[PDB]
Every structure is written in structure tokens, then in C-alpha cells.
Amino acid sequence: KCPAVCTCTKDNALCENARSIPRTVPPDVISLSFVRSGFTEISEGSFLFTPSLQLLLFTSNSFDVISDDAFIGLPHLEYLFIENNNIKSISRHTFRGLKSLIHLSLANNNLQTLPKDIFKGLDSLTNVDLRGNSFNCDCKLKWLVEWLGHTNATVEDIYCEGPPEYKKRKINSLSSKDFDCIITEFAKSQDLPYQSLSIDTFSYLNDEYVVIAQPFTGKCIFLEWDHVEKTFRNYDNITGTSTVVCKPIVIETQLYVIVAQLFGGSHIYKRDSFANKFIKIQDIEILKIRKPNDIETFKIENNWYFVVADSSKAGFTTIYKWNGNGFYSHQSLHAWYRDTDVEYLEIVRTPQTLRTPHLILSSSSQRPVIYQWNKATQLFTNQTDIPNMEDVYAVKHFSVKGDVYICLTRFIGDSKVMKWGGSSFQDIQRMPSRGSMVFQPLQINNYQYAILGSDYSFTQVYNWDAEKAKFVKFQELNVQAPRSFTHVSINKRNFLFASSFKGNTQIYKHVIVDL
Amino acid sequence: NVEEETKYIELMIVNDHLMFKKHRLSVVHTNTYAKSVVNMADLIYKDQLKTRIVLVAMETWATDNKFAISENPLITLREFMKYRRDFIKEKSDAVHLFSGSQFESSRSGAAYIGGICSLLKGGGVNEFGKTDLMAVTLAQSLAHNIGIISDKRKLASGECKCEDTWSGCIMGDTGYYLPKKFTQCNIEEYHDFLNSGGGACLFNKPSKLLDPPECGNGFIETGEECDCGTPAECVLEGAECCKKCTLTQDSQCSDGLCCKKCKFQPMGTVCREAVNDCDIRETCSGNSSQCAPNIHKMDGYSCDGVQGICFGGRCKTRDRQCKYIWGQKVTASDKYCYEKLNIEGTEKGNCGKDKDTWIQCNKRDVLCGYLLCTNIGNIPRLGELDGEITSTLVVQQGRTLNCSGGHVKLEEDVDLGYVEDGTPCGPQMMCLEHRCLPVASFNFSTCLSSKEGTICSGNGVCSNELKCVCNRHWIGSDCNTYFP
Numbered sequence: 001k002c003p004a005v006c007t008c009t010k011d012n013a014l015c016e017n018a019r020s021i022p023r024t025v026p027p028d029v030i031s032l033s034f035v036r037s038g039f040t041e042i043s044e045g046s047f048l049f050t051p052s053l054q055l056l057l058f059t060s061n062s063f064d065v066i067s068d069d070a071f072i073g074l075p076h077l078e079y080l081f082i083e084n085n086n087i088k089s090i091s092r093h094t095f096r097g098l099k100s101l102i103h104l105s106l107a108n109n110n111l112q113t114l115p116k117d118i119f120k121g122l123d124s125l126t127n128v129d130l131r132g133n134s135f136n137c138d139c140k141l142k143w144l145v146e147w148l149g150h151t152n153a154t155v156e157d158i159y160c161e162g163p164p165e166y167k168k169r170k171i172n173s174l175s176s177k178d179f180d181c182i183i184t185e186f187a188k189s190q191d192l193p194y195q196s197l198s199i200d201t202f203s204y205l206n207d208e209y210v211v212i213a214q215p216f217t218g219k220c221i222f223l224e225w226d227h228v229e230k231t232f233r234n235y236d237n238i239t240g241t242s243t244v245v246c247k248p249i250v251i252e253t254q255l256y257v258i259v260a261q262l263f264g265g266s267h268i269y270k271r272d273s274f275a276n277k278f279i280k281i282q283d284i285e286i287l288k289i290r291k292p293n294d295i296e297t298f299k300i301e302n303n304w305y306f307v308v309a310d311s312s313k314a315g316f317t318t319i320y321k322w323n324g325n326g327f328y329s330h331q332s333l334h335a336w337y338r339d340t341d342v343e344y345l346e347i348v349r350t351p352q353t354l355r356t357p358h359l360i361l362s363s364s365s366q367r368p369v370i371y372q373w374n375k376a377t378q379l380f381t382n383q384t385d386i387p388n389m390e391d392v393y394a395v396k397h398f399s400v401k402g403d404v405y406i407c408l409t410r411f412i413g414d415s416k417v418m419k420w421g422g423s424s425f426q427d428i429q430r431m432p433s434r435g436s437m438v439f440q441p442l443q444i445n446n447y448q449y450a451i452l453g454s455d456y457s458f459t460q461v462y463n464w465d466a467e468k469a470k471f472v473k474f475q476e477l478n479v480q481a482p483r484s485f486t487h488v489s490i491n492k493r494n495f496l497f498a499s500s501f502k503g504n505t506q507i508y509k510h511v512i513v514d515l
Numbered sequence: 516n517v518e519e520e521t522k523y524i525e526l527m528i529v530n531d532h533l534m535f536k537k538h539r540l541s542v543v544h545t546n547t548y549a550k551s552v553v554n555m556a557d558l559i560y561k562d563q564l565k566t567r568i569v570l571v572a573m574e575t576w577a578t579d580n581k582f583a584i585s586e587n588p589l590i591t592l593r594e595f596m597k598y599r600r601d602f603i604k605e606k607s608d609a610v611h612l613f614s615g616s617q618f619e620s621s622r623s624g625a626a627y628i629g630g631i632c633s634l635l636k637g638g639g640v641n642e643f644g645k646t647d648l649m650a651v652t653l654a655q656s657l658a659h660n661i662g663i664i665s666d667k668r669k670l671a672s673g674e675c676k677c678e679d680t681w682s683g684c685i686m687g688d689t690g691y692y693l694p695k696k697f698t699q700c701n702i703e704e705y706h707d708f709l710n711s712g713g714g715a716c717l718f719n720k721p722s723k724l725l726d727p728p729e730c731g732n733g734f735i736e737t738g739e740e741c742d743c744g745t746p747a748e749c750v751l752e753g754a755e756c757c758k759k760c761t762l763t764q765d766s767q768c769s770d771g772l773c774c775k776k777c778k779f780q781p782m783g784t785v786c787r788e789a790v791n792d793c794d795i796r797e798t799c800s801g802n803s804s805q806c807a808p809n810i811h812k813m814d815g816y817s818c819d820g821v822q823g824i825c826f827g828g829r830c831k832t833r834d835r836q837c838k839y840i841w842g843q844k845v846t847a848s849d850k851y852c853y854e855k856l857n858i859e860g861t862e863k864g865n866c867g868k869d870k871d872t873w874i875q876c877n878k879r880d881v882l883c884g885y886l887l888c889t890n891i892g893n894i895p896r897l898g899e900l901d902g903e904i905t906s907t908l909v910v911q912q913g914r915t916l917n918c919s920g921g922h923v924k925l926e927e928d929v930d931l932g933y934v935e936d937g938t939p940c941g942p943q944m945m946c947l948e949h950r951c952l953p954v955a956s957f958n959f960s961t962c963l964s965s966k967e968g969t970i971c972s973g974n975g976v977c978s979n980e981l982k983c984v985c986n987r988h989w990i991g992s993d994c995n996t997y998f999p
């Protein structure tokens with residue numbers, strides 16, 4: 001009562017060069033083995049009518065696929081060894097239906113992949129052997145990493161054979177780092193009917209509000225999250241002529257907004273307590289501040305300051321200290337220069353360990369210059385220029401771990417990222433771009449992006465690579481004339497605003513994908 | 516109409532050594548860069564002032580810096596005009612300097628106001644900058660040379676407005692957002708400058724560019740017998756005449772004031788009338804398609820009767836000086852006011868200052884002293900008021916006249932409120948350094964004369980280029996021959 005292809009003793013069966021699986025075994029057969037059989041594939045739902053099996057092994061065979069539920073009908077199956085074969089892929093529910101399985105070995109058959117949670121359903125498992133296979137390590141072997149540390153069953157060590165970047169590395173020794181298995185995408189949730197220039201946000205009573213500077217019609221737009229079936233809605237306007245920058249400041253639960261124009265442009269507002277109407281407080285002199293370009297807000301040592309980038313040679317860059325009632329002139333910088341941008345950044349200047357506030361302002365034809373804060377005189381004293389780059393329009397800053405880097409913008413040429421050393425800035429990455437009016441890094445949930453706009457071609461968005469220590473090309477955005485990019489964080493919802501000078505401005509939604 | 520004619524500025528640019536070194540110490544780079552600056556400034560002037568700027572000559576100093584450059588743009592302007600007057604012999608309507616050094620001043624450049632078509636005042640000085648930036652600087656310097664002013668009573672009060680709120684105008688202070696358009700008041704100030712007989716030499720249309728020829732640009736170069744503003748705008752004038760920048764046999768004139776339906780003008784037909792008593796009206800030669808180069812009366816000719824004497828086609832009197840300094844509503848005071856003020860030697864009337872002392876004015880130099888005007892406003896139309904205003908009331912036989920004056924500052928040594936040089940104090944008299952002097956002390960000349968004691972034989976008018984414009988019934992260089 002034993003097939004002629006197989007050599008069979010009373011309780012054991014050894015089959016070689018079998019074309020198809022015989023489904024009829026002697027009742028007292030316990031163990032079964034297949035060696036170099038001519039099987040194309042395992043039979044779908046095979047090994048029924050033979051429940052007496054306890055041990056089953058396959059060696060030196062050739063399999064393209066092992067179908068799901070291939071081992072159903074084996075309630076007494078305990079040991080299973082499929083090794084020393086050549087297999088490409090198996091299906092996940094293959095081992096499903098075997099709760100009596102204890103020992104399993106897929107070793108040395110040169111497997112490059114395994115489907116997520118292949119081992120579910122085997123709760124009696126004790127020993128598993130996967131050694132001797134070429135392991136290409138990606139998100140599949142990430143779930144595998146999840147399973148190795150969580151299973152009480154013992155598993156001998158296995159090693160990554162791919163990618164060549166990760167060679168001869170223990171799969172047991174891997175963490176969540178260097179696995180960006182999550183995909184991030186930016187898709188436009190909303191398009192706004194108006195062309196924009198600058199955007200900034202502020203938080204009041206758990207409500208987040210966003211300010212937009214519309215230059216031509218002169219509208220300083222204040223919008224809010226409607227929270228009722230609406231993504232964004234404009235709730236208030238401030239009307240001025242040739243508005244450039246609308247920067248809000250909140251000091252001690254009080255809302256103040258600075259608007260800048262080129263004629264009678266210096267203005268400081270404060271919101272009315274009742275009806276949320278904005279009321280103008282101060283008018284800074286027209287004669288001293290002419291043709292403003294950029295405005296940055298910064299607070300230093302329990303004191304709020306305020307800086308305006310004067311784009312005119314006649315006017316000077318000015319910092320304003322704030323007493324109880326309003327802003328008044330504190331210091332002036334860079335006389336008889338055309339200042340394109342100003343930036344505030346706190347860096348660690350050696351040998352000193354704490355951070356020191358610093359200012360970086362860029363001119364038209366001039367190299368950017370840096371000012372070091374001096375506490376004793378309440379001034380910025382040490383003034384140095386960063387060498388070997390010209391025609392820098394804007395400089396932005398970001399910090400990764402304990403290092404602080406800067407992104408320097410160039411309209412035509414190499415906009416480049418630099419590392420802050422102990423004394424000066426060090427070259428990190430050179431990135432060519434055309435028509436770039438902005439190079440803005442953004443930090444969103446431990447993800448450092450860097451957006452480089454273009455008034456001519458696509459806006460190039462870059463992502464941070466942790467172990468490559470530089471940015472990498474990430475995505476391409478279609479915005480007419482980008483000028484500023486702003487990160488907006490709602491309750492568990494993340495958005496980005498993209499300015500458009502010659503076209504309608506865009507609102508993108510940040511989405512996170514789990515694969 | 517003098518406004519409707521599209522004028523042409525013959526510009527010569529001189530690049531110093533610092534500018535040459537910022538341009539890779541290379542001749543081609545400096546040349547192309549300056550050409551581009553002139554290109555942008557000309558793109559501005561073309562739409563605004565109906566005036567083209569053509570660059571016909573350029574010289575760059577790669578050997579050494581010729582003179583002593585200064586951080587003050589005014590000193591650099593003076594010294595540069597000294598270099599032009601003593602060295603530069605090339606013919607041009609204006610000569611500007613492109614300097615690589617930085618000026619420590621509120622201004623990006625300096626140029627003499629209304630100095631166009633002068634040898635001494637015909638220049639300008641601009642500092643280094645980006646392309647569009649130095650295009651603006653050259654635009655406002657040439658605006659100074661062409662008679663445009665930035666400040667005025669109308670602009671200070673608000674009547675003259677720049678209506679670009681996102682960028683200033685050219686005469687205003689320049690920021691990173693650069694101006695593209697003038698105010699209408701600047702336009703009308705230019706038009707008033709031209710209606711006064713100023714800027715005569717700007718009607719010469721350049722036929723030789725120093726760059727390779729191009730068809731369809733509006734200028735006739737070598738290899739082409741005719742040119743149009745553009746193939747699209749040709750249709751207005753010269754579309755019957757010129758195709759592919761070549762004329763058909765029936766036509767020799769593409770376009771111009773003297774060309775009508777592809778025919779020249781009859782000789783002696785008037786293209787442009789005289790704009791004042793200093794200008795001479797020009798007639799079509801019947802040879803060229805453009806009207807004859809602008810020509811005005813020679814210096815020393817009487818204008819506005821005996822009240823003024825012609826300089827550069829422009830009439831200089833004390834009434835026009837009052838109206839120019841303090842606005843159109845101002846009128847010159849009666850002679851009693853000067854005649855009385857000079858004797859006292861007070862602060863209100865005076866003839867000059869040596870060292871914190873007033874000179875007792877002579878009785879002949881009375882009208883060369885402090886300039887006085889009846890109805891005076893609080894602010895000067897140009898420059899800024901040094902000190903405070905002056906008001907002396909004078910009574911004669913019960914008549915009361917508030918004679919008023921002021922000291923107006925442009926340059927440290929240039930002070931308005933003083934009688935301008937060349938202004939007549941008396942018949943056959945003129946004011947120089949606040950003193951009445953005869954005309955024979957000015958070394959005057961007068962075109963070849965055929966008859967005795969008569970300018971151009973008395974049958975014609977002398978020109979600024981020292982050539983006789985005979986009247987009717989007279990021909991020749993001296994106007995001697997008679998032709999009825």
C-alpha cells in the first residue's frame with residue numbers, strides 16, 4: 001500500500017524524483033520526505049487525506065510558488081523542514097492551518113523575500129531556522145525585524161545580503177532608523193483666488209490663524225480654520241497700500257501685527273478686544289524706513305525685538321526694542337546698503353558652549369554678513385561676512401540634532417547648504433536652481449524638508465537623508481512664482497502654504513503613507 | 516512741435532580701472548556690461564521721454580587711473596569734467612563715468628543740472644552696481660543733465676505724485692525694487708526744459724553705431740539704405756519705401772520729418788520753428804530724410820529784448836531765474852529794491868561773502884548781487900534753503916514792495932539766489948562773479964561777416980557753431996553774395 005516512486009519502511013517514507021504528490025499513504029506512515037522531485041509547484045491545498053503526518057521535509061527541489069493553505073489537512077504535523085532548494089516567492093497563508101507545528105526550517109534555499117506575518121497561526125512554534133539565505137533588506141525585512149524581537153521561540157542569527165549598503169549585517173541588530181518605510185507626499189488641498197507673497201501663523205486660544213500679504217491690491221489677509229466642514233476661510237482683512245510683509249507678534253496674550261509698505265508703510269496694529277477689529281497703534285517714520293523687503297520677529301532674553309530689512313540705500317536696517325506701550329528704535333545696521341533679507345538664528349559659537357543669538361542679512365551685490373550679540377552693550381558687535389558666495393538673495397536656517405545648518409538662496413546659480421562650525425560656516429551641499437526666490441527648510445514631525453522654488457521651472461522639494469548627511473531630491477511642486485513656503489500645523493493635521501506672485505497661491509496637505 | 520520729435524542723446528561712457536578689474540580685467544566684459552546698462556536705461560527712456568540714448572564712443576582705462584578719485588561724487592564730477600575738457604576730444608552730446616569705487620553719500624551718482632550740450636557741464640558720474648541698478652543711476656544722472664528735478668513745491672505739497680506704490684520713481688530714492696516709470700511732472704519738467712531752448716544738440720540722429728549693424732532696430736547702419744522703428748511700426752512711416760532695410764528705386768527716404776510718401780522735403784521747407792528768441796528755425800536741406808541739426812543763436816545775442824543774453828539756446832534773465840528757483844507764480848522785483856538793498860550791506864541784500872563779511876556793493880553791480888523776488892514761498896523748488904528767508908519792505912511815494920530773497924543750495928560752491936553768470940546787468944553789460952562787466956571782457960566771437968560791424972553782414976544770424984544763417988536774399992559764408 002505504498003507508491004512505487006517512493007522507498008518506504010513501516011513508519012517512514014522517502015520519495016525521490018516524484019512528478020506529483022501521492023495523496024495516499026499507509027496509515028502507519030509518520031514521516032515523509034521529498035528529495036529533488038520533479039515537482040513544478042506544490043499542489044494547491046495539498047496533503048489532505050494524510051493526517052497521520054508529523055515530520056515533513058523537502059530538499060534539493062525546484063519550486064516557483066508555494067500556494068496558500070498548501071499544508072491544510074495536517075492537524076498532527078509537528079516538524080517541517082523546507083531547505084536547500086531554489087525558491088523565489090511563497091504566499092503568506094501557506095503555513096496557515098498548522099497550530100501543531102513546533103519546529104520549522106526554511107534555511108539555505110536562497111530566499112530573498114517573505115510576506116508580512118507569514119508566521120501568524122503558528123502559536124506552538126519553538127525553533128525556526130532561516131540561515132543561509134540571501135536577504136534583501138527593506139520594509140518586508142522590517143516587519144521581519146518586528147517579528148524577531150517579539151517571538152519567544154529561538155531563532156539563530158541571520159544576515160542582510162542586500163542592499164550592498166547593508167552587507168553581512170544582523171537582521172536582529174536593526175532598529176527603526178534607516179527605514180523610512182513611511183512615504184510622505186504633498187498634495188494641494190486648496191487653491192486660493194489671490195496671488196500671495198508672504199505667509200505666517202500664530203496661535204491664540206487653541207485657534208490657529210494665518211496671515212497672507214497680498215501686494216498689489218494691498219490686502220493683509222487673516223484666515224482661520226473653520227472646523228465646520230471647511231478647510232480654510234478668510235475671516236478678516238486689513239487694507240493697506242503696497243503691503244510687503246505681514247508679521248504678527250503675540251506678547252503677553254495680546255495680538256500685534258506689523259505691516260510694511262513703501263509709502264507711509266511703517267505701521268503697527270493691535271487687535272481690538274471686542275469684535276476682533278485690528279486697530280493701528282504706531283507709525284514709524286517714513287524718512288528712516290523706505291522700501292522695506294523682509295521683516296523677522298525675535299525675542300532675546302525676556303525682551304521682544306523686531307527687525308526690518310531696508311532695501312533702500314538711503315534707509316538703514318533697523319531693530320526695535322519693545323517697552324510696555326509700543327515698539328521704538330533700538331539699533332540700526334548696514335548703512336548705505338540694499339538689504340534683501342534678514343534672518344535670526346541662535347548658534348553655538350566656540351569655545352563657548354551655550355547658544356548666542358546671531359543675525360544674518362543679505363544684500364543685493366554683497367556677500368551676506370553675520371552679527372554676534374553682545375549682552376554687555378545690548379548690541380550686535382562682531383560683524384563678519386561668509387566668504388566665497390555672492391548675489392545671495394535670502395538666507396534661511398534649520399537645525400538637525402545638535403548641528404545648525406543654513407540654506408542660502410541664489411536666484412541663478414548654486415543655492416547651497418552650509419554647516420555651522422566652531423568659527424565659520426562649512427560647505428555641505430551645492431544645489432543648482434533657476435528663478436529661485438526662496439530656499440526654505442521646514443521641520444515637520446522629525447522630517448526636515450527643504451523647498452527651492454522657481455519662477456521658471458518646477459519647484460524642487462528636497463528631503464533629508466539622516467546617514468547621507470545631506471538633502472536628496474524628493475518631490476516637484478507646480479507653483480507659478482514661489483516667494484515663501486510656510487509650515488502650518490493644525491490639530492493632528494499638517495499643511496504647507498506656497499506663495500505665488502504671478503499666479504494663484506496654493507495650499508498643500510501633508511500626507512503620511514504606511515507601507 | 517519740439518516735444519513730438521524723438522530726440523537722440525549721443526552718449527560716451529568712460530570706465531575707470533576698478534570697473535575694469537571687477538570685469539575680469541577684460542575689455543570685452545566691461546564693454547558688453549556697459550552696453551547692457553545703456554540698453555536698459557534706453558529701454559526706459561524710449562517709453563518715457565520719447566528720447567533714445569545711443570552710445571557712440573567708449574574708452575576704458577586699463578593702464579592707470581588718470582586723476583585723483585574722491586569719495587564725494589561732486590568732486591569726482593568736477594575732476595572728471597576736467598579730464599574731458601583737457602583730454603577727451605571725441606564728439607558727443609554727453610560723457611558719463613562708470614566708477615567701480617563706492618561713493619560715501621546718499622546719492623548713487625552726480626550730474627550737473629541742465630548741463631546737456633556743454634563741454635564743461637555736459638558730463639555725469641555714476642558708481643558701480645548691478646545691471647538694472649546702474650541703469651537707474653545713469654537714468655537719473657542723465658535726467659539731471661536733461662533738466663529733470665526730483666523735488667519741487669508741487670511734489671513737496673503733494674500735487675506732483677509718483678503713482679507707483681510698489682516701487683519708487685527714478686528721481687526718488689532707489690531701493691531693491693527698482694523704478695521703471697517717471698512721474699508726469701518729470702515729463703513736464705523735461706518739456707519745460709526743451710521749450711526754454713535747452714538741449715539743442717539732442718536732435719542729431721546717429722547713423723554709425725559702434726556695434727554690428729542690425730535691421731529693424733530703427734537706426735540706419737552701413738549695408739542698409741533705410742531703417743524703421745520695427746517691422747510692426749514701420750507701417751506708420753516707411754512701409755511704402757523700405758523692405759528688408761532696402762528701398763525700391765522710386766524712393767530714397769524711408770521715414771522722417773522731411774520725408775513725405777517716400778519723397779524728401781523741398782529744400783527750404785521748415786521742419787522745426789524757433790522755440791524762443793535764442794533759437795533759429797531750421798529748414799529741410801532736401802538731401803537728408805532727417806531735419807537739419809538743431810542750431811540756435813550764438814552767445815551774446817539779446818533775448819526777451821534787452822533783459823537777457825542767450826546761452827546754449829536758453830535765455831537767462833533774473834525774472835526767469837526767480838520763476839525757476841521759487842516757482843512759476845514768482846515775479847522779479849522792481850529795480851528800486853536791489854538799488855536800495857545793496858547800499859546798506861545788510862544780510863538781506865548783499866553782493867557776496869569773502870570771509871564772514873559783506874562787501875559794499877558798487878552802484879553798477881547792483882543787479883549782480885542778491886537776487887530778489889516779490890512773492891516767495893517757504894520752500895525752494897530745487898536744492899535746499901540755507902539759512903532762512905529774506906524779506907525787506909520798501910516804500911516809495913506811498914508804494915509798498917515786499918522784496919524777498921533766499922540762499923538756495925545745490926552744491927557747496929553753487930548757491931542759487933545769486934545772479935547767474937552771463938545775466939545782463941545793463942545794456943552791453945553782464946554779471947560775472949557778482950560784478951557788472953562789459954561784453955568785450957568775455958572774448959566773444961561772431962560768424963564770418965561780409966558787411967562791416969554787422970553780425971553775419973547784418974543779413975543773417977550767427978550760430979553756436981560759428982556759422983552764418985543768412986536771411987532772405989543772401990547767400991555765402993559771410994552772406995556777401997546777393998541772390999534775389
Ligand SMILES: *[C@@H]1O[C@H](CO)[C@@H](O)[C@H](O)[C@H]1NC(C)=O
Nearest residue numbers: 147148149150151152153154
Ligand atoms: C517573550 O514573550 C513575552 C510576551 O509573551 C514578552 O514579554 C517577552 O519580552 C518575550 N521574551 C523574549 C526574550 O523575546
Ligand SMILES: *[C@@H]1O[C@H](CO)[C@@H](O)[C@H](O)[C@H]1NC(C)=O
Nearest residue numbers: 194214219221234235236237
Ligand atoms: C477680504 O478680501 C477678499 C479678497 O482677498 C475680498 O474678496 C473680501 O470681500 C474681503 N472681505 C471684506 C469683509 O472686506
Ligand SMILES: *[C@@H]1O[C@H](CO)[C@@H](O)[C@H](O)[C@H]1NC(C)=O
Nearest residue numbers: 372374380381382383384385
Ligand atoms: C569683529 O570681527 C570683525 C572681523 O571678523 C572685525 O571687523 C571687528 O572689528 C570685530 N569686532 C570686534 C568688536 O572686535
Ligand SMILES: *[C@@H]1O[C@H](CO)[C@@H](O)[C@H](O)[C@H]1NC(C)=O
Nearest residue numbers: 782799800801802803807808
Ligand atoms: C545739399 O546738397 C547740395 C547739392 O545738391 C549742397 O550744395 C548743399 O550744401 C547740401 N546741404 C547739406 C546741408 O548737406
Ligand SMILES: *[C@@H]1O[C@H](CO)[C@@H](O)[C@H](O)[C@H]1NC(C)=O
Nearest residue numbers: 889890891904906916917919
Ligand atoms: C511778504 O513776504 C511774506 C512772506 O515772508 C508774504 O507772505 C507776503 O505776501 C509778502 N508781502 C507782500 C506785500 O508781497
Ligand SMILES: *[C@@H]1O[C@H](CO)[C@@H](O)[C@H](O)[C@H]1NC(C)=O
Nearest residue numbers: 954955956957958959960961
Ligand atoms: C581770450 O582772452 C584771454 C584773456 O582773457 C586772452 O589771453 C586770449 O588771447 C583770448 N583768446 C582769444 C581767442 O582771443
Ligand SMILES: [Ca+2]
Nearest residue numbers: 294341342343
Ligand atoms: Ca528672513
Ligand SMILES: [Ca+2]
Nearest residue numbers: 525716717719
Ligand atoms: Ca546729437
Ligand SMILES: [Ca+2]
Nearest residue numbers: 729730734736
Ligand atoms: Ca539698423
Ligand SMILES: [Ca+2]
Nearest residue numbers: 794795809810
Ligand atoms: Ca533750432
